[PDB]
Design a protein around this ligand. Structure first.
Ligand code: CL
Length: 158
């Protein structure tokens, strides 16, 4: 099963945090990386201008069940990243999201696939389109049509 995973990171030096994360993803049992998108650069949310965020997408072939894959992405987030001390509820310093899991639709208490907001997020869709331009979502919508209709601005490269 081909899973597509969004990776984000702005902490310390994003390039080596993300590279360590990719190595971790590749070491997930019963799984191997098919391809990784380019690394992209997105500005921080808020006017205060935090560090720049590094965004990418990974195609991972896996025979794990979706919740088993979740277990590993959560483990990697714990091992490779941390919580913001002034915002424990805020996003961690390394973000992994399972965007898509084959053609599966999953609405459990722990796991929602497709990612619930990805169709509204250029920073998830553009890297995905780079590695999977002909992708079709479980509901039949084409990735290309979403990017075209919604007219999301392209992302700058890291
Ligand atoms: Cl869908």
């Amino acid at each position: 099963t081909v899973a597509y995973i969004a990776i984000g990171s702005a902490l310390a030096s994003p390039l080596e945090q993300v590279n360590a994360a990719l190595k971790a993803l590749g070491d997930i049992p019963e799984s191997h990386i098919l391809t990784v998108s380019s690394f992209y650069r997105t500005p921080p949310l808020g006017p205060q201008d935090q560090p720049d965020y590094l965004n990418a997408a990974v195609a991972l072939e896996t025979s794990l069940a979706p919740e088993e894959l979740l277990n590993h992405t959560q483990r990697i987030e714990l091992q490779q990243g941390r919580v913001r001390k002034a915002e424990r509820w805020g996003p961690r310093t390394l973000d992994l999201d399972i965007m898509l899991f084959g053609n599966e639709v999953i609405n459990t208490e722990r796991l929602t696939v497709p990612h619930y907001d990805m169709k509204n997020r250029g920073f998830m869709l553009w890297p995905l389109f780079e590695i999977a331009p002909e992708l079709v979502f479980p509901d039949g919508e084409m990735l290309r049509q979403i990017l075209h209709t919604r007219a999301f601005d392209k992302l700058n490269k890291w």
